């Protein structure tokens, strides 16, 4: 009956805890603890290449990111196992974060590069390997596209980490090409 596996569940708990902390302590204070290394002296605090994905600055995006995390990530963990979801998550957070700060610096956050990796991965893995038992529904492809399109044309009030989203998508596509050559 329960849809979310342990990894799916633990990532949602972490995001909520961080989000609470950003209300109590404020956004900037948490960014300093968790953002991508913003100084050379912090290049070995290894959590920071991943913990940027846990911070949200707006209610609307924590909602939608956790929604597709819960749905897509939940599907990957249930059909492909926990470790597989873990790997997609870590690599996508790493590389999306890399491409983002390269062209825009380190002050970004959100779990959406990981989400876009999951979209791409679920999708292409279903397209190229239907036996796997995962598939990106058409309704979702549309919702995803509109959301992306909104981000890229700035239809939210916010500043968007587009590099990280497109990077994220790319990673998930690549991983699914590899995985689907069995």
């Amino acid at each position: 009956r329960e849809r979310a596996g342990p990894v799916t569940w633990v990532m949602m708990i972490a995001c909520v805890v961080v989000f609470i902390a950003m209300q109590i302590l404020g956004d900037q204070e948490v960014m300093l603890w968790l953002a991508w290394p913003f100084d050379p002296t912090l290049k070995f605090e290894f959590w920071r290449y991943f913990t940027h994905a846990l911070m949200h600055f707006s209610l609307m995006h924590i909602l939608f990111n956790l929604l597709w995390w819960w749905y897509l990530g939940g599907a990957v963990e249930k059909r492909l196992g926990s470790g597989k979801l873990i790997v997609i998550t870590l690599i996508s957070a790493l590389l999306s974060g890399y491409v983002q700060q390269k062209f825009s610096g380190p002050w970004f956050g959100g779990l959406s590069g990981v989400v876009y990796a999951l979209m791409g991965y679920v999708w292409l893995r279903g397209e190229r390997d239907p036996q796997s038992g995962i598939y990106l529904q058409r309704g979702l492809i549309i919702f995803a596209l509109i959301w992306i399109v909104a981000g890229w044309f700035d239809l939210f009030g916010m500043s968007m980490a587009n590099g990280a989203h497109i990077a994220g998508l790319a990673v998930g596509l690549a991983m699914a090409f590899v995985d689907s050559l069995n």
């Binding site: 949200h56 983002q100 825009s104 956050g109 959406s112 980490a161």
Partner: peptide, 4 residues
């Protein structure tokens, strides 16, 4: 901050 920029969101992803």
């Amino acid at each position: 901050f920029a969101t992803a």
